[PDB]
Structure formats: C-alpha cells, structure tokens
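Schema walkthrough. Field components (list of strings):
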Amino acid sequence: HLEKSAVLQEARVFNETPINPRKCAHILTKILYLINQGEHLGTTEATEAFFAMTKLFQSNDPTLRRMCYLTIKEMSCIAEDVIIVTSSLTKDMTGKEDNYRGPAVRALCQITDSTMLQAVERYMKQAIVDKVPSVSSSALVSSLHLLKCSFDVVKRWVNEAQEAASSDNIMVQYHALGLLYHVRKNDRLAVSKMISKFTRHGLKSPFAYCMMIRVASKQLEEEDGSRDSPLFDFIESCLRNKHEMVVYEAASAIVNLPGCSAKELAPAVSVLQLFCSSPKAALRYAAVRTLNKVAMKHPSAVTACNLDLENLVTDSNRSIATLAITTLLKTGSESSIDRLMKQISSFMSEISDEFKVVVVQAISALCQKYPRKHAVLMNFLFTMLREEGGFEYKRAIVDCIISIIEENSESKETGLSHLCEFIEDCEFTVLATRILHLLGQEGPKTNNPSKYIRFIYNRVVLEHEEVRAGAVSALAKFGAQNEEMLPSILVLLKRCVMDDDNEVRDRATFYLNVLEQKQKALNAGYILNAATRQEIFQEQLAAVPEFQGLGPLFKSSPEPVALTESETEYVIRCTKHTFSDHLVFQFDCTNTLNDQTLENVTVQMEPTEAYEVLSYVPARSLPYNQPGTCYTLVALPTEDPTAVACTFSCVMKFTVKDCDPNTGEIDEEGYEDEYVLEDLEVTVADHIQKVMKVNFEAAWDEVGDEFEKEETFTLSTIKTLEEAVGNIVKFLGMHPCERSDKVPENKNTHTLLLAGVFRGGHDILVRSRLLLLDTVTMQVTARSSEELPVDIILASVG
Amino acid sequence: LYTVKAILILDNDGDRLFAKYYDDTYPSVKEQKAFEKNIFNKTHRTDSEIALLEGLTVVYKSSIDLYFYVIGSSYENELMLMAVLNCLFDSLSQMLRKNVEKRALLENMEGLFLAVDEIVDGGVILESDPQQVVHRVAL
Amino acid sequence: EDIQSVMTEVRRSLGEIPIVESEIKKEAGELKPEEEITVGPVQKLVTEMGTYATQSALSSSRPTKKEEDRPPLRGFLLDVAASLATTLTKIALFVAEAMLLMATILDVDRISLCLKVLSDPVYAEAYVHVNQYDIVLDVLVVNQTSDTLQNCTLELATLGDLKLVEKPSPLTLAPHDFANIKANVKVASTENGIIFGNIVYDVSGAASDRNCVVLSDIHIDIMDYIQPATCTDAEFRQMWAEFEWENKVTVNTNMTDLNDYLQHILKSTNMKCLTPEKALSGYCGFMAANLYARSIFGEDALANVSIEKPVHQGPDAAVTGHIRIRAKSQGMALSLGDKINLSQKKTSL
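Field assembly_structure (string):
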C-alpha cells in the first residue's frame, strides 16, 4: 500500500554510505510507487525530500542518476525551486556520461523561467544540434513543455534556426516535423516554398508523411492549388510503399465525384477496400461513416452491394459490427434484404460484440433516414423495434420520437396508431413523459378525434395520478383549439370524467376550480401561453456633427471597395454613399495587425473629375480587429460638364503606436508613418435610382430636346455589342428597355433605351441604338435631365 | 503527438497499477476510476480488435494476466498506434525473457516504468520499436 | 401569520427532497391575509424574498425530478376592491428591505457552498349436451340393424378436470331398434392437459364393426367456462398491470352498439365488467371497460379493453379498441382473446 510516512522517516537511510544501489533504489521506488498510483502532499515535505535526496550525490552511481530523474520528473508544472541541480546539469554538460544529461534538461522545461532561460543558451543551441541522434532527441522534447509556457525564446532564432532540422534519421525526421506543426501554425507561406522541400524529397518515416498529410489535406479543402501534379505525386506516394497507413489515410478524403473524380482512384480504392475488407485495417469501419463519405451516384451504388454483404454476413469484430451499420446505411438498402437482416439482428443485437451500442448509433441513423417517414418502414421497424427489444429500444425512442417530430410526420394516424398501441404494452412511464409533453402541444391540428380521445382515455386509464394527469395537460392546447366536433362536448367532458383521491381529487377539482375561476375562453388563452436604403445611411452618418453638408442619401455605392487589399494589418473595406447634396465615404474596418493600433488617423483624398472638397475625417483611434469610422466628405457639383465621378487619392496617416495586447499602455508618444491609401473612384450608380419613365414617349424625346450628346463609333474588327454590353448594363446600373433589352445567345439588332435618375435630383437618360449592318456602327445617346450626366454617361459607361 | 491521455496498465480488477496521464485535462482519481469503470467494466478483460470510445481511439489490449489501456484519439491511425502497443508487450517479454503477469507486476514495477518513459514521454511518442531500446537499456 | 412563520421554520428545518407548487397554491386561497394587511411595494418585496428562496433552490440543478413547472398561474398568483387587488397583482408581475433580504438569500448557491465545504341401418347420431357441469353424451345409436348386431369396444380414461365415466354395458345393435346411450362424463376431474380438449377418442370396430369412429374432439371452448368475478379498482389497476400481460386481441368490428353488443358478449362468456364511471357509454362514451372473471378450475382473467362506441357521426360501429387479455398461459390467454373474438360477433360458424 501507499503512505508517505515510512519514507520521510526512512530518509535517514540517506545517512548511510553502505547502501546497495538496489537497496536504496527500492526505497526510492517506494515513494515513487505511491505516487505512480497517486499521492498528494505538502511542498515543505517535498522540498525536504529534495534536500534529503539531493544530499546524496557524490556518485555517478548510474542508477542513482536515473531515479532522481524520475523523481524530479514527477514535479514539472507544479514544481519547487530550480536552482539546486544547476551544477549537476552543467556537470553533465562538460561530463560525457552522455546518457544522463538528456533526461535532466527535459524535466526542467515545464518548470522553467526566463532568466534562467538565459542560461543554456549558447550551448543549448549547440545541444539541440548536437551529435548522435539520441542525444538530440532528448533535447527536443524538453522544449515543448516549455512551449506550453512559451518557446518563442526559441523562436526567434528561426531563419537561421530551421535549417539544422535537416535530418538523417527517419525517426528523427518524423519528429522534426511536428515541432513544425506549430511551425506551420506560425506559417503558411513558408510551407509553400517549403513544401517544395518536403515535396522536393521523398520521405523516410511513414510518420513524417502523416502529419503532412493532414496538413496537405488541410490545404486541399478549398483547393491546395493545382494539386493535379502534386496530388498526383502524392497519390502514388500515399498509394503504395510498405507502410499501409498512408494509402488509407489518403483514401478516405479523396473521393471527389458527385459527377467528379473517380478515375484511377476508384480502382486503387477498390484494391484497398477489398484488401482491408476483412480487418486488415479494422480502420475501414470509421471511414464509411464519413471520412470516406458515401451517398452514391446511381449505377455506382449497385456495385457496392458485395462488400457490405461481407460485413453484413460476418457479423463479427467490433470493427465489423460498426462497419455493417455504416456501409449498409451509406450505400442504402432494398426493403427485402432488411427482412432477412431483421431476423439476423434479432439474435445479434444484444451482445455480439455488444452490438447494442453500434446499433443505437445505427438506429439513430435509422430514425434520421426515416424519422416517421417511410412510415411503413417506420412501422415495420416499430414493430420490430419493440419486438427485438431487450429493453434497449427506449433510449432509441428518445431519438426516434424526436425524428418523427422533426419531419413533423403526417402518417401520424398510423404512426401514432402503432405508438399508442405498442407503447401500451411496451410500457415505460418515462417515455410517456416526453411524448406527452409533445403531444400536449399538437392536438387538433391533426384531427381524428374519436381515436385520439379513445387513446387519451387509455393513457389516463393507467394508474398514477401522474399518468392520468398528462392527458389533462396535453388537452389544454387541444381543448382550446377544439376539433372536428369538440367545443360543446369539450365543455361536457370534463364533467363526465371526474376524480377523487384527494390530491388526485384535487387535480380534478382544481383544474375545474381553475376552470371555475376563468371564462373558459379567456382561461384557455392565458394558461396556454432619393432617400434610399442609403438614406438610412445618410442618417447613420448623421450622429457625427462635424459636417460640412450632407443632404439625404440618393443611392449608395454599387460596390464597397476594400481600400486595403486582402488581410492587411490595416484592412479596409470602404463604402461610398451619395446624397442629393454631398457624398460621404465612410470607411469600415479592422486596423488589422495586433502590432498596431492607429491613432491620429484621418483620410486623404485628392480628386480628378469634380467635387468640392470640404474635409478628410479620420477616426480618433483604431485598435485591432474592430471597425471604427473615418470618413471623408465632399459636396457634389451637379450641372457642370464633369463634376461627381471622380477618383480620389488616398493616403493613410497615423501615428502608429505598438501594442501589448496582454495589458497594453496608451501614452501620448508614438510616431507617424503614413501608408498609401487606395483609390476611391466614384460611380454612376452610387447616385442613381434605375427606373422606368414617368413618360417615356415624351420623356424619351424630350430628354433629347434639352439634352443630348452623342458619340458614334464604327466597329470594324469585331461585330459584337458584347464588349460594349459588358461596360454599359453593368456601369450605369440601369435598366435596358422599350422591351429593348433581350437578346438570346445571339440576336440580329439591339437598342437599349435605358433608365434611372441621377443625384441632385436630375435624371440621366441613355438610348443606345446599337446598329448592326454587319459591322456595328452605333448611336449612343445620352440625354439627361441633368447636364453633368450626358457627358458622363458616354464616359461612365466605360 | 502529445497525444497520450493516459496509458494505463490496468489490472482487470479495474485496478490500475499504472497510469500515466501523459496528457490530461480531466482529473480525479475517482473520475479516473469512474471513467475507467464504465469502459473497463464493459470491456471486462475482453477488449476489441479495435475500439473507439469517445471518437477517440481506445487501444487497449489484454495479456494473459493484465489489461492494457492506452487512450488516444481516433485522429491517429491504428497501425502505428498499435505498433507501440505491440512494442509494449513484446520488448518486455523478450528483454525480461518474460512478458507481463500479475505476478511479474507484483514483484517489481520499476522496469515498466523505466521502459515507459523511454518509449513515450507524454503526448508524443518518442519511439515504438524495441531494439534501440534493448541496446540502449542495460539495467 | 402564525401559520406562515411555522411554515418558514419547518421549511428551514427540512431540506432533503420533495415537490409542491401545488402546496403553494394550497395555502394561498382565492384571497387570504398576508403581511400587516398590506405593505404594498414592501409587500411586493415580501412576496419576493419568501417565494424567491423557494425559487432559488428551484433555479438550481436536479437529480430525479420532483415536478416540471406549470406555474403559469404561478405568475398571477404571486402578483371593486377585488378588482383593484387583481390590478395590483398584475402590476407586480419596507419593500426595499424585503428585496435586499431576497437578494441575500439568492437555494442552489447555498447547496453549492455546502458541496465545496464537503470537498348403416344402424345409424347412430350423437351430439353432446352439456347439461349443468356435466357434459353428457347424447348418443343415439340406432340400430336399425337387422339384429342386436354385435358391438365393438369402448375404452375409459382420465380426462381433464373431468373424466369420462359411463358406458351403458351391452353390445347388441338390436334390430331396427333405437337406443340411447348415455355417457356421463365426470366434470370436475381427470386432468388431461390436452388443451381445448381435442383429444382423440375411441369408439371401436371391435364387433359387428370392422371400423368405427376414432375421433378427436373439437367443440370444446372457453367462453362459457369462466364466470364473472370482481375487484377494488386502485388495486385493480395496479394489478392489471401486474398480471400476465402476455395476450391481447382487438376489438374492432360488429353489427350492433356495445350496449346490446356488450351485454350479448357478457352473457355469452358469462363474465364480469367490474365497474362504470359515468362518462357515459352513450354520448360516445370514450369508455375503457374493465373486466374480470373467475372459472371452474379457478383461473382469474383480467381485461381492459378500451373502445370507441356507436352514435351517429360520433364514434363507434367498429371499435379499434384493443382487447387486452391476460391469462396465465399465453396460449390459453390469447386463445381466449380469440375465443372472445369468435364470441364478439354473430355470423355462420
């Protein structure tokens, strides 16, 4: 047995020099045992123990060197001092008992601290790197726990650091990479050029391969680029060798075919499937459940029958039993075979590797593929379920019932019919509770009153004040609703059925009394229970008051622009808003880097095609991963030729301040640097409402009358609208028209006579007669109810 | 890969005479026993070719006297995983010239212990074959 | 207030399991005295600490359920004169002090703390007459024979709870002559376990006769045998469930209402329906009828049949009622369900 006490006293054994390595070791062992089994104790005593132990250390008694390692080893994230050895670690360090040296460092590292961290370091560097593979291994492990704590101390070393990871032992080679699990956690790019290194060389450890796979895979999901050759390359690689695991590993993800890859891969897979198909890799079971997914394609499915038939047949191997349920499921089944199986199952399920659990899982799947649906099956199943039984169905029922509800099943009359009956003579009060509750809600939306009543009475029939009680409670939702005959009678019934038995009496009385207390109708009720989208933005913007004009928003942006490209530290997405008077660019964001918070932020814009520039606004502070707002404001000139479409030049200015995210500091100092700000271009669709005309005929002409500018091109290398088309529907954001829009994948002639209204109120109108002689020569008209738009449309459309 | 929840060598009296939770994040000697109980009681010296419990790989074995448990995650292939488990029986057997027994267990723990740390150390299996060991060790 | 104080004290004293909301309701009454006679917001605060405590505990987690809450009214219940009072209660749905006390009380927290601390001419015609216990054999052997033709042989036997027991001795088949041959059977003994009878019987070819009749009987059924018998209902229910569950047959279909129909069936089997509740075997009823009977060789058989019941465009001209039959052997029991099934209707046998 275990107990601390003998040992502390026994520490006086330390006092002897005549000792045998055995004798002491055992004593040492005894302490360790209590602990291996489990012990808990005071530090003071531990400390003491140390001292006591520590005390002994003249020798190199090798054995002695190990035990302590253990002992020490026992302490690592919940330690007591560090310093004591120190010398001893060094002593190894100059000292060639190679062996020993390695264990000791390793413990320290969960226990570690930064100053002390300082210690090893030149050497350490060496040490990780040093000699025989053995020693090196010892070194490695040590970090990791320190990585818990941190490890960055290490980290730093890195450009330089990795390269040594270059290996010549398999075991080792495998190992190097995980540290690279975290290395790749740190970096993706690095991998990529890296891979070409991993990719570059054929590998040693099956083991090494594996991490890569996950990774490799991980990469693949969205696509790991043109895996074609790599994937392929890999594909061999996974595919064959003398180490099975890889082939399989690859296999389970890789399918690809809903009308997709199936080529080589299905055969190879088959070689495997079959090969596995009797517990080579008892692994095979899991896969079918998802890892290697199945829900088939139609001829494909027919082919599957044989393999599943082997498992189905075999009935053995825990790995087998599971396999039977998934394979059968995934591939699906005919009715008929089920029948054979029901009998098989009849024996099987109880224990046949403890079939019941796999089966409950299987069952959970059954309830799902048919959760009261193929009700005939549901009933067949139901009969069978209850029947094959044991008892273990109940658990299943919890799921099954749930499934039926999920559908909100409709062959309830029948479904319910089975349930009702069987449950009656399939017992368990507990089920009733659940079902009651559900039923409780449902009532007269599904009618069949007499039956349902018929049932209900029965349910009550059973004793239990409690059993009885549910029929009344369910009823409240029901009663209230009434059904194909109920209200009159509903009133009659509570009367007809009535009970004593005191608290059972009370229940009748009380419900009544309760009933007594409200107008039963009431009773039931209580108990039972422009100036666009963009304008909104004009207002949203409005809470600020530094304005220099606004108006009401007319239309907003046809496209928000990320003003800082992808996943940048100062990630910007920008949205632009037009009002009848001003345009505001309000800037949406995630000052990205946790490096930074940007401060003293304002936004420069500098313009080419008019706007009067009132102000650049910036956000006061922007910390990491959190929108803040900065704005830039303009007033929109409307009656000029060239005056609201503009590109503005952006430069971000800030005083850049570093962060501690743990607990920061926010101080007046910090220094600016400025980074380029992306262009803003302003559109002819941030401003416009596309329309249909108040008066096309007239308007159409009219707009010409006052307004009209023209451009002609004659098209001699291409006889297609389409280029033009890409620029026009899309740039203007207006409607192509006069039933003069439509073109199939070809068409002889086309007119878009097109619409919307521009900001500042007045309209911008376009007629594009595209004419095909067989060259295209075309008349583009822009006509407008605003001056700035006719010149604009012709440009803007591009 | 920092992947051993524990490796335990359990008696088949539900007892555990070895456990190292290499990695752990749940506790209690009791809960450990309880957890143990559900599964052990259930497997009851019987094991499986494979067993997954918790979506997690359970590779466990039995001897002729002892029950071997490793808990890991079904998130790392059998063949290897087992290989370590295999390694555990075999080396102990050869080296000692005898594999595990209840008796064996009773006379001395240490060797197991010695081995164990060497083979595995936490949630990372540093090694899984005997030989290296065999030379390496010389106790 | 005396009562209130007592309640609080006892509550404090206990703690170790229960269930009542219903009780809460029970003390309260439609109205009742509470507080001085009113202390308004403070009184709202009063309701809040005493009730909150009950609740705090309530809010906490569970083992076996005690009862899933349906305290909807519970809510009004906590919050011209009568009308005014109601309004006040709705609004709610010294005072400051009460609120503070309630907060302090807020009892899952307490429980948690405790846990922490712990841590041929001759023509013979025959039929059976069973006349009162005694199944008696009418035999006409009519020997319209040309003489007391020699007759064969007959053999005795143990029977069921009966034994056959008589033979008129001679063996002549007197010429052109008619005879009454009587067999009494012994109706309380001779076990033979060849159920439903249907046991082979012999009349032999043993003398002016080359053959004869060897027969097995059929015609031996239950519905008759059992007599009605009776029970206390609570105990009954308990029992009903308790009994040999193992047989059931369904009622569904006939020619009549279960008034006349039920009566008919009842009389036919000579058996009991134990008790009515007037709910109403008329307007519908939506009645499940419990029936009990005890027989001549003493089996008690239990039924609950639950049945729709005739009535215009309401329900019953089928049933789809289930007849649940309990009789010790399933084999007779189910068979009984059948037997009754035969009994149920009236048609060409």
